[PDB]
């Protein structure tokens, strides 16, 4: 047994969710199109994910609280009144599908961008619209199978809208739908994202493991040639220098290329001088590389590195939301699947276990609903870029 204090706390949390999420999403979609700098692919995806919650809350929450604290469903006897029970599940399922697919797309493009190392594009808009359509298409099942049934509270012929399946497909869906929900809205968003995160973490270490090695080999070969006694050592170190320069020039994206060409030409000049046996001329030519090294290569290495600093910052902002959403939606599934296979059909622990499971589910509902308003808070506390816009 759970008291009506549950009803009152449900009402208060619903009002809180409304008054917080409405404002938060309003400011977020105001900022996303106010600033001329915050326009890009990831930001367009975040704006779509944010707008997907206003049309859920400002419509679902009021009817939900009214029905929670009133006699029955609003407008019991109306042509469009019965449409409310059709619209109620459809919007929620579409919202959750939109959120999951948007997170998956964020993971996909985050992995893609790191590989291609060095304002909404057509591809981003196409993906956004495709996800928007697919969510509704997949969620129509909930809007087709909801109907109202009669009941006799205080002798009336009143209506209450339950899941009374009519078509054979509806019975088939009702027979097994919890497993499909669990797999689709909890497994794949928690599997593909992990795989793509691992791929990134691996490449980034690689795309930077090499650069450091190339820079190190150039510097240590410089140190070798600065003390090379004979021409053999000069040739041996200059071969490594040339290989390193050619390898590093490929990593450089299209200024810097001209500098790398100049460095290769100067290394060739030093090698040609060393071939004739003029050790002193070779040492002087190698010493001449200071002008090129501290004019083109240093800035290139600095920008490249610091660029990769930013790329990761976004990745962490994107991947915080996956963990937050998973922690929000885990408890409800936990109480939905332990009451299916190990369900308390006749277990003697109904004195203790049943109440605990009831409370867990009846708070998991609220925790899952809280996910429609927390995203502004997480973005504000973690992005450090939207934080500046929010402050202003």
């Amino acid at each position: 047994k759970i008291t009506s204090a549950f009803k009152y706390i449900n009402t208060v949390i619903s009002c809180t969710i409304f008054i917080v999420g409405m404002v938060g999403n309003a400011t977020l979609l105001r900022i996303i199109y106010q600033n001329k700098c915050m326009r890009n692919g990831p930001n367009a995806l975040i704006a779509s994910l944010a707008l997907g919650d206003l049309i859920y809350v400002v419509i679902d929450l009021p009817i939900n609280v009214f029905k929670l604290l009133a006699g029955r469903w609003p407008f019991d006897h109306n042509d469009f009144g019965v449409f409310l029970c059709k619209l109620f599940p459809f919007l929620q399922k579409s919202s959750v599908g939109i959120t999951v697919l948007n997170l998956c797309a964020l993971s996909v493009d985050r992995y893609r961008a790191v590989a291609s190392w060095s304002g909404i594009p057509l591809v981003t808009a196409i993906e956004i619209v495709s996800i928007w359509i697919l969510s509704f298409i997949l969620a129509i099942p909930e809007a087709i199978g909801f109907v109202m049934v009669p009941f006799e509270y205080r002798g009336e012929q009143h209506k209450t809208c339950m899941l009374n399946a009519t078509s054979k497909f509806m019975e088939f869906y009702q027979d097994v739908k919890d497993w499909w929900l669990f797999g689709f809205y909890f497994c794949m968003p928690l599997v593909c994202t992990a795989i793509f995160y691992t791929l990134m973490t691996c490449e980034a270490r690689r795309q930077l493991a090499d650069l450091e090695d190339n820079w190190e080999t150039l510097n240590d070969n410089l140190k070798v040639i600065e003390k090379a006694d004979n021409a053999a050592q000069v040739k041996d170190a200059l071969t490594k220098m040339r290989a390193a320069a050619l390898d590093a020039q490929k990593a450089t994206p299209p200024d810097f290329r001209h500098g790398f060409d100049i460095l290769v030409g100067q290394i060739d000049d030093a090698l040609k001088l060393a071939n004739e046996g003029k050790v002193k001329e070779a040492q002087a030519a190698a010493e001449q590389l200071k002008t090129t090294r501290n004019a083109y290569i240093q800035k290139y290495l600095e920008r490249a590195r610091s660029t990769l600093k930013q790329r990761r910052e976004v990745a962490k902002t994107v991947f915080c939301l996956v963990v937050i959403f998973a922690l929000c939606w885990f408890p409800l599934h936990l109480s939905r699947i332990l009451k299916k296979t190990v369900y308390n059909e006749m277990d003697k622990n109904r004195c203790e276990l049943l109440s605990f499971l009831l409370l867990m589910d009846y708070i998991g509902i609220n925790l899952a609903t809280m996910n429609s308003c927390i995203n502004p808070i997480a973005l504000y506390f973690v992005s450090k870029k939207f934080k500046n816009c929010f402050q202003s």
Partner: antibody
Amino acid sequence: EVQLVESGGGLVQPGGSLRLSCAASGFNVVDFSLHWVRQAPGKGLEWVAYISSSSGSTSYADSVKGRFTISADTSKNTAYLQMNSLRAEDTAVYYCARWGYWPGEPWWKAFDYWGQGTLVTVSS
Amino acid sequence: DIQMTQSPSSLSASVGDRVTITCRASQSVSSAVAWYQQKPGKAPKLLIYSASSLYSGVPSRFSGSRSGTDFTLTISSLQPEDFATYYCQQYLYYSLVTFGQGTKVEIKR
């Protein structure tokens, strides 16, 4: 198209001397370097010598160092290779290849046009 | 210096097969490696440069690949014009140039 033609080969006695001629047509010598590559009968390919027409730098491998002299004439558009103190093992087929200069793509194409091959034999 | 080793010395293959040859270097040379084709009594002709690039005038069935220090040449379809001697070269600089021993491809019966 770019053409390279080798000539001036024949049988010589051991310790003799010989001179070749790799003529270039269809392109300027001062825009592409020249190299000589030797192939023994039934063996692999090996490097011999190299001349740059513009800079004038010439290089040789340890197999022919001290007995092979490589030069060229830009006005004649022809390179020459002179061998002295030939040996019996030295007999082989020689080719004259070309290679571009560094800045830009032509360096990345390596040997793109070869000659035809000149057979040199040493016997008594 | 910088010796190059070719894995298969001889290789028997019939028409319409896939063949692969491997070259290995002794030093960290970049993509400066090339392949040549030679029929007996003729000057070799270029096939691939920069370790992955088609030279104008060769069929698209020829392909190359780079992975670290090892290099791989692949022919997906072994047409009756692919029975020759294939050679493998590195050209990191003008003076230091070395060749491989060569590979001979023949019929299978």
